[PDB]
Amino acid sequence: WADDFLAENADIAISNPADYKGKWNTVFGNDNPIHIEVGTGKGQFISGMAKQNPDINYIGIELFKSVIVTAVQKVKDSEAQNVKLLNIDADTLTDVFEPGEVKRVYLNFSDPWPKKRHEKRRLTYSHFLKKYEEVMGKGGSIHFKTDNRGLFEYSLKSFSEYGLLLTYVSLDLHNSNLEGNIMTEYEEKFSALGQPIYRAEVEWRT
Amino acid sequence: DFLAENADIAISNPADYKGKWNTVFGNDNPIHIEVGTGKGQFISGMAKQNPDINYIGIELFKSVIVTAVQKVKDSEAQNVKLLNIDADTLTDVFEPGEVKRVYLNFSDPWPKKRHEKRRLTYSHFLKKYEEVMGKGGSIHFKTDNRGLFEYSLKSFSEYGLLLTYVSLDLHNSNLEGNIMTEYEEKFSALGQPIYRAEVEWRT
Numbered sequence: 444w445a446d447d448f449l450a451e452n453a454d455i456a457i458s459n460p461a462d463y464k465g466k467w468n469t470v471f472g473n474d475n476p477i478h479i480e481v482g483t484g485k486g487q488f489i490s491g492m493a494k495q496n497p498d499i500n501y502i503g504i505e506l507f508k509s510v511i512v513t514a515v516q517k518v519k520d521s522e523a524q525n526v527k528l529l530n531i532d533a534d535t536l537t538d539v540f541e542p543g544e545v546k547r548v549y550l551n552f553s554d555p556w557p558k559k560r561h562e563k564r565r566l567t568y569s570h571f572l573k574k575y576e577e578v579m580g581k582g583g584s585i586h587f588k589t590d591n592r593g594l595f596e597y598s599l600k601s602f603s604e605y606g607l608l609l610t611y612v613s614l615d616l617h618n619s620n621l622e623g624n625i626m627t628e629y630e631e632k633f634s635a636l637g638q639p640i641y642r643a644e645v646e647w648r649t
Numbered sequence: 650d651f652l653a654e655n656a657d658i659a660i661s662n663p664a665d666y667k668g669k670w671n672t673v674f675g676n677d678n679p680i681h682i683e684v685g686t687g688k689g690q691f692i693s694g695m696a697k698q699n700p701d702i703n704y705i706g707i708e709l710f711k712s713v714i715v716t717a718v719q720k721v722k723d724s725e726a727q728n729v730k731l732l733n734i735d736a737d738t739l740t741d742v743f744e745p746g747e748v749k750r751v752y753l754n755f756s757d758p759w760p761k762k763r764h765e766k767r768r769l770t771y772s773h774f775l776k777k778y779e780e781v782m783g784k785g786g787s788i789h790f791k792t793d794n795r796g797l798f799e800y801s802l803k804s805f806s807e808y809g810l811l812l813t814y815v816s817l818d819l820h821n822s823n824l825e826g827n828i829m830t831e832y833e834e835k836f837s838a839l840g841q842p843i844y845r846a847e848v849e850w851r852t
């Protein structure tokens with residue numbers, strides 16, 4: 444079963460992440476920056492980023508146990524030693540990291556939750572911006588990609604209301620020559636479609 | 650000269666009314682300006698839509714502003730003036746707070762980095778808008794140019810303005826009273842996206 448697979452690969456899929464709060468450098472065995480992805484899905488993005496940037500430590504967060512099993516297999520097939528995976532939600536980030544332990548949050552094709560009464564479930568809503576702040580501290584950035592126009596418009600306004608600085612914005616990423624862009628599985632199936640991929644980098648003011 | 654004979658619409662001495670544009674309109678209706686009015690379809694249409702708002706359009710080229718004058722005349726609207734001035738002259742014409750909103754429609758993109766300083770969303774110009782609006786105003790910005798819109802969102806953010814509205818496809822976003830420019834109406838048959846932002850000052 445999926446639960447046996449994750450128990451057997453517990454060196455990648457860390458079962459006790461709260462035990463490493465403030466000590467994640469001892470987990471990776473170096474003092475390199477830790478970047479996280481909230482919503483790893485099947486794990487092509489974080490595996491690709493781990494192989495591209497071996498001097499960056501990566502931690503994928505993925506609530507959905509069914510899909511994280513796949514992420515563990517792609518991390519294993521990658522042979523990258525700089526990536527762990529946590530089967531937790533965004534609310535638990537503050538149980539796992541101290542302020543400043545994370546340098547960057549990746550969000551890729553987050554659930555848009557388009558209905559007004561579901562605003563608080565969007566991963567760009569103010570509550571999650573605060574969770575990201577509590578793990579990144581003074582500096583820190585969010586690198587955000589979505590195909591959903593409603594979510595990206597909402598996110599630009601949410602980022603702005605929170606007081607973040609927009610340093611990068613593309614309203615058509617695949618025609619914008621972002622060198623070293625690592626696609627998610629979902630993103631790969633868009634260049635043929637022709638619909639724009641939206642991208643933002645936003646940072647805390649210092 | 651066409652302008653001399655329509656000098657109650659085209660004001661040749663706008664610097665003389667600084668701090669007293671309410672004496673020109675004859676009321677304390679909020680003053681909204683357009684920087685780069687072109688042939689005037691937009692400011693004519695806005696004036697007809699919002700008779701409770703005083704509109705002042707600025708156009709650098711006299712050859713273009715005479716067409717704007719005619720369109721204002723044809724609309725029969727009494728709440729529109731047109732100034733043949735540059736955007737740097739705005740602080741000679743308006744007291745801080747006398748203007749309540751700045752409209753920017755399909756402004757020149759100036760993509761070359763040496764000409765960033767000519768883009769009307771560059772910090773120099775956001776400061777000029779601040780000097781005529783104080784902190785109680787907004788900028789309403791439409792463009793089809795993706796590069797200029799991307800630059801402008803970033804320029805707004807660096808300046809510290811609050812983004813309260815953004816559409817990445819205006820003609821599929823159902824803005825109820827949208828008044829188009831000549832360019833907006835003709836060249837939106839392509840299905841090229843129209844970008845729109847509303848930004849304001851943080852109090």
Ligand code: NA
Binds near residue numbers: 469470472
């Ligand atoms: Na180690």
